[PDB]
Amino acid sequence: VYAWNRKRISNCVADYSVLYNSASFSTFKCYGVSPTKLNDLCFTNVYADS
Amino acid sequence: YNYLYRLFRKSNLKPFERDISTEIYQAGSTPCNGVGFNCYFPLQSYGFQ
């Protein structure tokens, strides 16, 4: 966690419905955006920090 | 925690509409059957400090 690995996503189509419909996750939360609205949106970049 | 707001609704409120309902909100594609994960209780608190 000190060296947390970031992925930058660009020039690509990113589904969040596979993320929020999956039973696999012990927690799922969102801030500033509705989780149901995510699939309608477009961004310059998307980042995933792991 | 005495103060509350509604976090989810299945449609927008009309002008000066008022809604006390606490029915469970199906956020996923999978049905909730009145009861959890992707099946959320719709009222939440600011927890003011």
UniProtKB/Swiss-Prot annotation, chain A:
Changing L19I: In strain: Omicron/XBB.1.5, Omicron/EG.5.1. Changing T27A: In strain: Omicron/BA.2, Omicron/BA.2.12.1, Omicron/BA.4, Omicron/BA.5, Omicron/BQ.1.1, Omicron/XBB.1.5, Omicron/EG.5.1. It comes from the Viruses. Changing S22L: In strain: Omicron/BA.1. Binds to host ACE2. RBD also interacts with the N-linked glycan on 'Asn-90' of ACE2. Cleavage of S generates a polybasic C-terminal sequence on S1 that binds to host Neuropilin-1 (NRP1) and Neuropilin-2 (NRP2) receptors. Interacts with host integrin alpha-5/beta-1 (ITGA5:ITGB1) and with ACE2 in complex with integrin alpha-5/beta-1 (ITGA5:ITGB1). May interact via cytoplasmic c-terminus with M protein. May interact (via N-terminus) with host bilirubin and biliverdin, thereby preventing antibody binding to the SARS-CoV-2 spike NTD via an allosteric mechanism. Attaches the virion to the cell membrane by interacting with host receptor, initiating the infection. The major receptor is host ACE2. When S2/S2' has been cleaved, binding to the receptor triggers direct fusion at the cell membrane. When S2/S2' has not been cleaved, binding to the receptor results in internalization of the virus by endocytosis using host TFRC and GRM2 and leading to fusion of the virion membrane with the host endosomal membrane. Alternatively, may use NRP1/NRP2 and integrin as entry receptors. This is Spike protein S1. It comes from Severe acute respiratory syndrome coronavirus 2. The gene is S.
